[PDB]
Design a protein around this ligand. Structure first.
Ligand SMILES: Nc1nc2c(ncn2[C@@H]2O[C@H](COP(=O)(O)OP(=O)(O)O)[C@@H](O)[C@H]2O)c(=O)[nH]1
Length: 303
């Protein structure tokens, strides 16, 4: 079976991976990497990796340098946790000290082991201030040198009263989960048209920027409607699919998913994509879905 590891780095990334643990992603192994020993005690994520001593200067933990130095000190533990994976996902909320600085170290450890590495990260809300935004962008520059594909979700693009801080980050958590689940479950729980992992590697390895959209529909034309909804999703509104060197598509549904629906989704995606590129369409089986069919589209090698 495939070995797929999902690593939440820092507080924001740990929170996103905790959401993935609660909502489930089939067949993946979850890890939390953090300088914050208290966060590692509290997390429901089953495997934790302490980086650095866990002993803090006041406000020192906000510098990405602290997260970078901590991860570098514990590169042996990172390597030992990642060794043997077929794919690694790195989730982080960029802008703090630990995610921003440690996530590129985790990514490079995986890259140097030869593991297909995909990062799905957020940028801070503008209200968090320019300093955090500058830290985040510098961290994304560094992360981009060490990953195969990078999906960057600006919190400002996703999102009132009754909206708590917990609720505000829940929106990001759902998108990060959708990207990880959409890619991984093609491998860990295939449906009638099983994707070949070499096709996943083809569209994700050393590709650069990527972006995800998703849609879901029920009824007679569910396949068309879900695919069209994914292409028209707010995250892909600015990305022409025919500018993507790769396109990965996950159709998720129950036992009733039909070959004609696979063909229809493929026709729709190929209508919008280019043909000087590589397209990969796979399926996942979710036995608890009745009526509904979800389409997740990951455009890779955009720029
Ligand atoms: N998804 C998510 N993002 C968060 C959360 N808390 C903060 N963030 C975002 O992630 C960034 C860094 O988070 P923080 O906990 O301060 O530092 P970290 O330990 O390096 O992750 C922040 O600037 C926020 O944009 C959270 O609970 N969930």
């Amino acid at each position: 079976d495939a070995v797929i590891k999902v690593i939440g780095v820092g507080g924001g990334g740990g929170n996103a991976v905790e959401h993935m643990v609660r909502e489930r992603i089939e067949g993946v192994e979850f890890f939390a990497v953090n300088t914050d020993a208290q966060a590692l005690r509290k997390t429901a994520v089953g495997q934790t990796i302490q980086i650095g001593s866990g002993i803090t200067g006041l406000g020192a933990g906000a510098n990405p340098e602290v997260g970078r130095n901590a991860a570098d000190e514990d590169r042996d533990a990172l390597r030992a946790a990642l060794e043997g994976a077929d794919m690694v996902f790195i989730a982080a909320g960029m802008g703090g000290g630990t995610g921003t600085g440690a996530a590129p170290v985790v990514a490079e450890v995986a890259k140097d082991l030869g593991i297909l590495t995909v990062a799905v990260v957020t940028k801070p809300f503008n209200f968090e201030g320019k300093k955090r935004m500058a830290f985040a962008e510098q961290g994304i520059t560094e992360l981009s040198k060490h990953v195969d594909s990078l999906i960057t979700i600006p919190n400002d693009k996703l999102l009132g009263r009754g909206i708590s801080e917990l609720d505000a980050f829940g929106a990001a958590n759902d998108v990060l989960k959708g990207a990880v689940q959409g890619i991984a479950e093609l491998i860990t729980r295939p449906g009638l048209m099983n994707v070949d992992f070499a096709d996943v590697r083809t569209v994700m390895s050393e590709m650069g920027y990527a972006m995800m959209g998703s849609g879901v529909a029920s009824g007679e034309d569910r396949a068309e409607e879900a695919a069209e909804m994914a292409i028209s999703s707010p995250l892909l509104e600015d990305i022409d699919l025919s500018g993507a060197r790769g396109v990965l598509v996950n159709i998720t549904a129950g036992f009733d998913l039909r070959l004609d629906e696979f063909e229809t989704v493929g026709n729709t995606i190929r209508a919008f994509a280019s043909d000087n590129a590589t397209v990969v369409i796979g399926t996942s089986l979710d036995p608890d879905m009745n009526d509904e069919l979800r389409v997740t589209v990951v455009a890779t090698g955009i720029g």
